[PDB]
Amino acid sequence: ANTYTAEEVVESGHRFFGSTSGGIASAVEKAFQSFGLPNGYILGEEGSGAFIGGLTYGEGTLYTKNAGDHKTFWQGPSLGWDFGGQGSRVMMLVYNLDDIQHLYGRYAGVAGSAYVIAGVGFNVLKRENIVLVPIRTGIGARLGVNIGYLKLSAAPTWNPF
């Protein structure tokens, strides 16, 4: 009862990405089939312009069913999908969040976890027992599956380590 269903997730993504494209449902249906039901999700925006495409700074909100909601910031290497001045949107599924404070830290990518279908892509990052699945669209769908590192923080920071 602390988990989200694929249907709730597909709806949040349809609304956040402004897309009814079948790729969103396909990618969500793939993440759940591989990892089960998340107990949180992050909607936010990323931009890489400050480091001219090579570092991504993101900002969004963590949504849970009974642990409240929280501003979340993140930093990582970028290929420039978010090099657009308005940045680009990302929805991350969060699995196994037991306590909000355990969310912050450094996430290591899982090799061969890239998945792309119909203009929607994700990969998998893990820290301790938390799995993180950043779902991106468009350019980010294809380029974001190359990030193997993401840091999550409670406050915005320039420092990605």
Binding site for a copy of itself (CB under 8 A): 23, 30, 112, 114-119, 121, 141-143, 145-146
Q: Which does 114 bind (CB under 5 to 8 A by kind): a copy of itself, Cl ion, none?
A: a copy of itself
Residue in 4, 56, 89, 103 binding Cl ion, rule: CB under 5 A: 89
How would you classify residue 111: left for phi > 0, otherwise alpha for psi between -120 and 50, otherwise beta? beta
Q: Which does 89 bind (CB under 5 to 8 A by kind): Cl ion, a copy of itself, none?
A: Cl ion
Residue 161 CA to residue 151 CA, distance in Å, equals 7
Q: Which does 88 bind (CB under 5 to 8 A by kind): a copy of itself, Cl ion, none?
A: Cl ion
- C-beta closer to Cl ion: residue 89 or 92: 89
Residue 104 CA to residue 145 CA, distance in Å, equals 21
Judged on CB neighbours under 10 Å (0-12, 13-18, 19+), 60 is buried
